[PDB]
Design an enzyme around this catalytic site. Sequence first.
Site, PDB file in Angstrom:
ATOM      1  N   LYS D   8      19.377   1.652   5.990  1.00 48.10           N
ATOM      2  CA  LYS D   8      19.772   0.547   4.814  1.00 48.10           C
ATOM      3  C   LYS D   8      20.249   1.230   3.492  1.00 48.10           C
ATOM      4  O   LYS D   8      19.676   2.272   2.868  1.00 48.10           O
ATOM      5  CB  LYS D   8      18.177  -0.169   4.479  1.00 48.10           C
ATOM      6  CG  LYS D   8      18.381  -1.505   3.618  1.00 48.10           C
ATOM      7  CD  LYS D   8      19.355  -2.316   4.427  1.00 48.10           C
ATOM      8  CE  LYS D   8      20.033  -3.521   3.461  1.00 48.10           C
ATOM      9  NZ  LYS D   8      20.815  -2.798   2.514  1.00 48.10           N
ATOM     10  N   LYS D   9      21.522   1.022   3.209  1.00 49.14           N
ATOM     11  CA  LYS D   9      22.083   1.411   2.270  1.00 49.14           C
ATOM     12  C   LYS D   9      21.202   1.833   1.109  1.00 49.14           C
ATOM     13  O   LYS D   9      20.619   0.930   0.412  1.00 49.14           O
ATOM     14  CB  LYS D   9      23.283   0.803   1.598  1.00 49.14           C
ATOM     15  CG  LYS D   9      23.996   1.166   0.344  1.00 49.14           C
ATOM     16  CD  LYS D   9      24.517   2.486  -0.011  1.00 49.14           C
ATOM     17  CE  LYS D   9      24.779   2.753  -1.303  1.00 49.14           C
ATOM     18  NZ  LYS D   9      23.556   2.439  -2.154  1.00 49.14           N
ATOM     19  N   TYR D  66      30.261 -14.156  -3.666  1.00 49.71           N
ATOM     20  CA  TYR D  66      30.930 -12.773  -3.675  1.00 49.71           C
ATOM     21  C   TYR D  66      31.602 -12.855  -2.372  1.00 49.71           C
ATOM     22  O   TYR D  66      32.839 -12.145  -2.308  1.00 49.71           O
ATOM     23  CB  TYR D  66      30.078 -11.828  -3.825  1.00 49.71           C
ATOM     24  CG  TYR D  66      30.246 -10.321  -3.634  1.00 49.71           C
ATOM     25  CD1 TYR D  66      30.869  -9.689  -4.744  1.00 49.71           C
ATOM     26  CD2 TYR D  66      30.666  -9.551  -2.544  1.00 49.71           C
ATOM     27  CE1 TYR D  66      31.390  -8.370  -5.032  1.00 49.71           C
ATOM     28  CE2 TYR D  66      31.004  -8.199  -2.687  1.00 49.71           C
ATOM     29  CZ  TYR D  66      31.438  -7.865  -3.766  1.00 49.71           C
ATOM     30  OH  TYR D  66      32.012  -6.265  -3.919  1.00 49.71           O
TER      31      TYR D  66
END
EC number: 3.1.21.-
Lengths: 162, 176, 176, 161
Positions: D8-9, D66
């Site tokens: 997970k970033k 976004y």
Amino acid sequence: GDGGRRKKGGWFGKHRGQGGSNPKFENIAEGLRALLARSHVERTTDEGTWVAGVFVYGGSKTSLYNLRRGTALAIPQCRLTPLSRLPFGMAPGPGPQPGPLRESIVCYFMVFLQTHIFAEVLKDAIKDLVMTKPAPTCNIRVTVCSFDDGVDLPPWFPPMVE
Amino acid sequence: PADDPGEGPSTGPRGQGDGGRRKKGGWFGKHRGQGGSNPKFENIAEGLRALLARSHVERTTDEGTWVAGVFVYGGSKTSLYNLRRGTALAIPQCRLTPLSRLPFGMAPGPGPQPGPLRESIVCYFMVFLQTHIFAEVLKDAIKDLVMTKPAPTCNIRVTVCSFDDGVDLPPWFPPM
Amino acid sequence: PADDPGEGPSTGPRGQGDGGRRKKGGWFGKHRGQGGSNPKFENIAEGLRALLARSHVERTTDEGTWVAGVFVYGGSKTSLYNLRRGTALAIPQCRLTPLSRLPFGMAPGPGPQPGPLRESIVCYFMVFLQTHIFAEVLKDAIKDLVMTKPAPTCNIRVTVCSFDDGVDLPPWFPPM
Amino acid sequence: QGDGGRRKKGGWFGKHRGQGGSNPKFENIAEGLRALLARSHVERTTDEGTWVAGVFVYGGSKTSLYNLRRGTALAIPQCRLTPLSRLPFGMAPGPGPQPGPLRESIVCYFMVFLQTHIFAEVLKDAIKDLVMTKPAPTCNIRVTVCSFDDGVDLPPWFPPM
DNA sequence: TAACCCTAATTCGATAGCATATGCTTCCCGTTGGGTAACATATGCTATTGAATTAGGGT
DNA sequence: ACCCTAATTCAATAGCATATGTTACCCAACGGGAAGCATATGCTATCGAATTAGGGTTA
């Protein structure tokens, strides 16, 4: 001299605007009154708004002051401005023009009249008496100042005096 | 160094010196009709000319006759004087008159009216303009600037003046 | 005192001020969309109100649709924020979007054109109104006000925005 | 763990605002917008270089907004996009007093600057169709064409280097 | 016969960390302006006053 | 035919006053800056759960 033929002046009170009728001014007022009588017109408007003005100018201070004093006596229903001097006009042909602030020695005084009709009548009367004067008084000149908004002269001056 | 600059055996606000030698009247040479472009006056002139730019119009007339004018009044002597100086700088193509006092207006109600020779404290100022169109633009600019300015300046009122035959200002003589 | 907390902080006459302490920094009890009247903004609002007074117009509509809008861009973030807060005080019937950054415009010449995602440093805030009539008067007031301002305020540019559908701001039902 | 055990970033990616790449997911969104706008061909920006037209977007969710913004950028580089912002609160319903002008709202929004109003309208219709087809909060996304009478002067300066 | 799972693919949510911007607030310091002591500079007010000028006017 | 003599009317003529011009400083207000604080995007990754079909029963 003056007051006493010897004093030749002094402090006689009569602050600026405290003018009183005298034979000379009364005679000028009488002549102006006859000229005003030429045309029957109202002086005090219902709204009492000084939207009109009689701009007197040129002539000489001695001639203008006497005319102003006479005009006051001739027309009780009006307002007068203290004598003021017009600014310099324009340089003749080529040459340096004067600044806006630059003012000439020429004196002038405007007469506030609530009604434009009577303002025109007064201007005509002033010209008639000025023209009649054979002295350096005919030099005096006058122009109508129509205030679209209407100069708001202070509508106060109550019975402040006890 | 009129009591003001830092240090010095005088001044007062900055540096030593009891002072007392500040703005001493002695005639600044400039006579009536000739005055210097003070920073405040030119600053006011900048605002006036900026509002004048809002409505670009002719600044002079071929005749050159000041048949048109404007009436500045109300406000305060100091504010009126500053406006007059700024108007001269902002509008070079105009003729200005020394500040004068208006007469007392009709007495309230049926109360005895003031004599047709009374002089109210209210001070008034005149601006000769050859171009009538510019006169309204100038008055509008004065009103907008005065309105944006504080109450004392906002008190100043201005109305365009129309001369029936115009005012014959005396031909100016260029100095030797 | 509260205005000058510390022997030598960045608050007060700075007398015996070593440097600064509890001066401008700190987390105040405020959040985005939550603000209070400030004398600086109040004075700006007063000027805007006077300019709006020049042309009194409808400031609210029965539909209340925020179809009317304005584009306050340019100048400086400080000036924009001050104008925005003042506009809120002057205009109660309005909606102020949080200050945002405009994207770069066409690159002059054949020079590589900036990307759509590319955003210029220029800041701008939009105001929602129920009637365009007031929007034009509001924009005119802002423009006239900034023009008088010699500060970057004059740099600020304002153009009325129009929303055909009309941005549907969420109803303020949440409270109670 | 930015890919790996947690996968997970987590940390600093070194990216910055405006540094939007052609993410395949965003490119697919752009592909949809492209097909939609392809239906109505129109000049995106005229020679005047004047951003007089705008495409205000809002509603839905920040993630959906976004994603739409990223797709719009890839689909239309000629236009100019704005960072997502929070809309202000609307009129208080009922007799309750309306909220303050400063008062904002969770609803996020972003406007697309365009030199051509016709293309701006086409973009709105295309975005609306994509928003409609996507049943996710993307459908909740709301878009409106914010026309500028004067025409917002987006800093028309070449991006140096 | 369509109607089911199912069970992962899918593609946008819905998350995971950084580091620009913003919103409200606060000190502040140029900043603009009015405003005021102090020469010179204008007129209001009275009054004579004198005079050049406007006649005079019947010798 | 013109001679004192009005005369005269209002400018001029002083001394008083007051009101304004042009400048030096003082203290005035006000709005852009700044600092620190939650406060929230950009971008990208990866990763989740509805989809979103895939298909293969059975009758």
